[PDB]
Amino acid sequence: EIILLDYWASMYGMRTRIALEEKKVKYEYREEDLSNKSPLLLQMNPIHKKIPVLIHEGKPICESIIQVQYIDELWPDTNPILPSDPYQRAQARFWADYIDKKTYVPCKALWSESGEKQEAAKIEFIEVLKTLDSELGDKYYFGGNEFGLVDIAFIGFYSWFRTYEEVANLSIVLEFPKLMAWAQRCLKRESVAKALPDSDKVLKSVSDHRKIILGI
Amino acid sequence: EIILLDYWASMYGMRTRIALEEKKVKYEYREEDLSNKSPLLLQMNPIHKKIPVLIHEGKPICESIIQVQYIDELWPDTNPILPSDPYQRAQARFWADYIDKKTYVPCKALWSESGEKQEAAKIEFIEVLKTLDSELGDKYYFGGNEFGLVDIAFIGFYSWFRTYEEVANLSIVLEFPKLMAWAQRCLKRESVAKALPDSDKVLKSVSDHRKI
Numbered sequence: 001e002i003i004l005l006d007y008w009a010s011m012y013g014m015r016t017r018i019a020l021e022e023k024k025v026k027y028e029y030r031e032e033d034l035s036n037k038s039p040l041l042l043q044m045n046p047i048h049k050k051i052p053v054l055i056h057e058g059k060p061i062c063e064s065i066i067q068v069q070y071i072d073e074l075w076p077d078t079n080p081i082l083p084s085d086p087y088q089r090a091q092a093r094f095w096a097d098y099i100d101k102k103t104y105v106p107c108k109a110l111w112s113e114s115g116e117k118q119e120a121a122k123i124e125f126i127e128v129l130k131t132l133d134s135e136l137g138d139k140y141y142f143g144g145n146e147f148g149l150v151d152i153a154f155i156g157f158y159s160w161f162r163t164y165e166e167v168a169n170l171s172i173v174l175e176f177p178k179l180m181a182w183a184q185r186c187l188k189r190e191s192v193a194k195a196l197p198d199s200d201k202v203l204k205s206v207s208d209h210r211k212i213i214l215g216i
Numbered sequence: 217e218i219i220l221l222d223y224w225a226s227m228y229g230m231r232t233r234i235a236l237e238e239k240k241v242k243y244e245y246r247e248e249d250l251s252n253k254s255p256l257l258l259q260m261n262p263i264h265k266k267i268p269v270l271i272h273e274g275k276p277i278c279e280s281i282i283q284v285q286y287i288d289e290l291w292p293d294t295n296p297i298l299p300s301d302p303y304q305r306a307q308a309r310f311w312a313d314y315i316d317k318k319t320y321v322p323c324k325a326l327w328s329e330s331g332e333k334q335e336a337a338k339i340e341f342i343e344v345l346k347t348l349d350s351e352l353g354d355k356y357y358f359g360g361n362e363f364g365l366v367d368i369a370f371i372g373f374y375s376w377f378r379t380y381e382e383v384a385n386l387s388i389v390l391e392f393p394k395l396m397a398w399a400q401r402c403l404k405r406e407s408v409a410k411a412l413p414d415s416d417k418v419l420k421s422v423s424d425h426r427k428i
């Protein structure tokens with residue numbers, strides 16, 4: 001029994017959706033209402049009370065990158081996610097940690113705010129894009145020749161690029177062609193295609209939120 | 217060849233010192249001047265430009281919990297740090313992540329700030345202590361019956377407890393006897409005793425810093 005408590009537009013939740021599909025395991029997806037958290041969510045993640053929460057045989061695993069590693073360790077011989085070499089594994093973890101640190105808090109403001117908070121977030125996210133663009137270099141994947149941990153860690157953001165361009169006046173698609181080509185590569189995988197929502201859907205939802213909540 | 221670029225009072229650097237000693241590997245420790253970062257530190261950690269940096273055969277590994285895992289994966293059969301069970305390993309990673317997230321900012325503020333910022337830091341750190349005390353429960357170690365990753369992740373903070381008490385007017389020693397007993401347990405390991413600086417030394421350094 002595997003249950004995933006998640007929110008459709010969460011790029012962090014998408015990571016775990018992708019990991020599960022890479023391993024071809026059957027699981028139950030449960031959509032959470034962020035304004036009305038389920039008792040199960042509160043019971044399983046009492047410390048943070050956030051999605052995604054992975055429940056395996058009644059036991060919770062919290063934090064998306066920890067979930068992905070857990071899934072890779074349980075089914076290591078089916079579409080291995082992490083590298084086998086300890087140094088390369090450390091580098092994968094580093095870049096996944098980088099993405100989390102630079103985006104989870106300082107980038108929610110990209111769509112949920114206007115004014116100075118949004119402006120600060122724009123500067124931060126453009127720096128993230130430049131840094132990852134440089135890290136990718138001319139490789140097919142962040143994992144080198146094969147799809148890996150860091151690819152999973154960032155690909156969900158692709159479904160938000162059009163939103164960031166429209167609500168935060170960012171230029172992403174035309175400015176980072178290497179990243180766009182990388183995303184198109186990843187999108188061909190069934191796990192990724194299944195996990196990522198349509199970009200127009202994300203945009204409509206965020207626009208509606210901004211109109212209703214921010215009056216913008 | 218193993219080089220560790222570190223700062224003596226960094227509780228994050230202490231983690232990697234402890235892991236290295238747990239594996240009994242020989243390494244070169246290099247003390248960094250935080251106000252004058254070496255060219256080697258900037259070359260090896262261009263993204264964050266912070267200590268600790270572990271250099272192994274000329275290749276950098278950054279971030280202390282990633283360093284500890286790296287060390288454990290290179291020498292897994294000598295004093296294993298992480299659990300062998302994947303679920304237990306996920307929980308260890310969770311609590312190490314919790315510690316990093318909740319402390320990295322509000323513990324700098326404990327000693328480097330005053331006023332509302334320091335008061336806010338005090339509330340956050342007391343919450344951390346209560347949460348970890350609850351998680352430890354009646355176990356000998358965060359790792360259960362044996363010293364493990366989460367123990368390594370938090371034990372360096374012990375060397376700062378006196379500082380937090382004195383500069384932030386916190387009560388820790390009298391309020392968390394289970395955590396105090398846990399720290400005494402950890403201190404019996406040579407790796408931990410070697411890594412943790414004297415509590416009074418940390419306080420003097422911080423006091424001088426606050427004045428100047």
Ligand SMILES: [Mg+2]
Binds near residue numbers: 081083146147
């Ligand atoms: Mg690979």
Ligand SMILES: [Mg+2]
Binds near residue numbers: 297299359363
């Ligand atoms: Mg153990």
